[PDB]
Design a protein around this ligand. Structure first.
Ligand SMILES: Cc1ccccc1-c1cc(C(=O)c2nccs2)ccc1C
Ligand SMILES: [Cl-]
Ligand SMILES: [Cl-]
Length: 371
């Protein structure tokens, strides 16, 4: 089980694709919901995501079929297509997934943020960093639901620097484009969802606290946070969850005026990566860094709740720390950070001490020595 949100709001979930092309926005929306008696949300909704997952893990696509057998009916505790909770303007998080992931795989984060009164737009990237994604070749294909699938691209050694940087820049553009889509919907601009789903986008009219915008992401998505902030000032702060810094250009590091929070796992980080995080620091800039004790890279993803403790530890989906304990720390410290830098009038400041790494299961800053 993916945990339910800890906040007071019920959580809805829907998908939005606009336009229908490989250049349009595809996102999964998590939102405060009016109702709590809908069907739970299908975690991985299409067989082709399992094929892409199997390719990314370096197995035969038939292991994809076995993963589908084991996980294809798994749900996440968000009310599918629930009406939006009316009568409040919600701050907006745009969320960026890791390499091999896609929009649906950070629901523990998305649901928790929504349960505290956020709208969350979890982007599906079309940079070939997702294990799979889909779109429609044209308007006829969209109408009949004839999906075109795009699978993870594997790189040769000498494509690494260049293609990862091309990908992070496309990812930033996709985050900006998703923001603009949501902001235009918030006006009441008619948008016809390329997916035929029983959620009226007209509900989102006048629902966004238009100045309270953040970008959050894991791993590749953590780099995407930083790229996005340097190029789109509409984002007011960023949270990089165990950022993989390698994709970022040399130019970005001095170009991030917004507050930035690094939440790291203990066992992923390494000096080359920490050195790159430290390049984002300047005395005029607001920077914070914490490390979750006993955690691994995938503690931020829903894969951490998908198996038992032994299989979990074996597959590096779980660390020595309990997965619920770890995600609570990351989500609560995130809430306090967003309250501070978005200027929210909630009670998230109760977790301010977590921003400083002041907890038995937190390391202030980093465990990694860079000398
Ligand atoms: C746990 C799980 C459930 C359903 C499909 C795939 C997985 C899986 C996932 C990873 C993983 O670490 C990642 N996959 C994509 C991005 S990270 C490693 C092993 C397994 C079995
Ligand atoms: Cl290193
Ligand atoms: Cl790790």
């Amino acid at each position: 089980k993916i945990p339910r949100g800890n906040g007071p709001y019920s959580v809805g979930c829907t998908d939005l694709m606009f336009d229908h092309t490989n250049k349009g926005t595809f996102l999964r929306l998590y939102y405060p919901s009016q109702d709590n008696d809908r069907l739970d949300t299908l975690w991985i909704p299409n067989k082709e995501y399992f094929w892409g997952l199997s390719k990314f893990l370096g197995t035969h696509w038939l292991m994809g079929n076995i993963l589908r057998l084991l996980f294809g009916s798994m749900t996440t505790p968000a009310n599918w297509n629930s009406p939006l909770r009316p009568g409040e303007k919600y701050p907006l998080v745009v969320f960026s997934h890791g390499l091999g992931a896609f929009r649906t795989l950070y629901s523990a984060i998305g649901i928790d943020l929504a349960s505290h009164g956020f709208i969350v737009a979890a982007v599906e990237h079309r940079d070939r960093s997702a294990s799979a994604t889909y779109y429609f070749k044209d308007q006829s294909a969209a109408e009949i639901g004839d999906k075109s699938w795009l699978y993870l691209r594997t790189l040769k050694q000498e494509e690494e620097t260049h293609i990862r940087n091309e990908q992070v820049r496309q990812r930033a553009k996709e985050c900006s484009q998703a923001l603009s889509l949501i902001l235009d919907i918030d006006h009441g601009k008619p948008v016809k969802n390329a997916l035929d789903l029983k959620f009226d986008m007209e509900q989102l009219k006048d629902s966004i606290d238009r100045e309270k915008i953040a970008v959050i992401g894991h791993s590749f998505g953590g780099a995407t946070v930083i790229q996005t902030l340097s190029e789109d000032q509409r984002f007011r702060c960023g949270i990089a969850l165990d950022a993989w810094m390698f994709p970022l250009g040399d130019e970005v590091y001095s170009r991030i005026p917004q507050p930035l929070f690094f939440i790291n796992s203990e066992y992923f980080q390494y000096p080359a990566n920490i050195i790159k995080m430290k390049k984002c620091y300047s005395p005029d800039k607001e920077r914070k860094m914490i490390t979750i004790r006993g955690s691994v890279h995938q503690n931020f993803a829903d894969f951490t709740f998908a198996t038992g403790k032994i299989i979990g530890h074996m597959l590096k989906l779980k660390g020595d720390i309990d997965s619920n304990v770890a995600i609570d720390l990351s989500n609560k410290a995130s809430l306090a950070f967003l309250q501070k830098h978005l200027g929210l009038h909630k009670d998230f400041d109760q977790w301010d001490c977590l921003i400083e790494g002041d907890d038995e299961n937190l390391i202030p800053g980093t465990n990694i020595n860079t000398t």
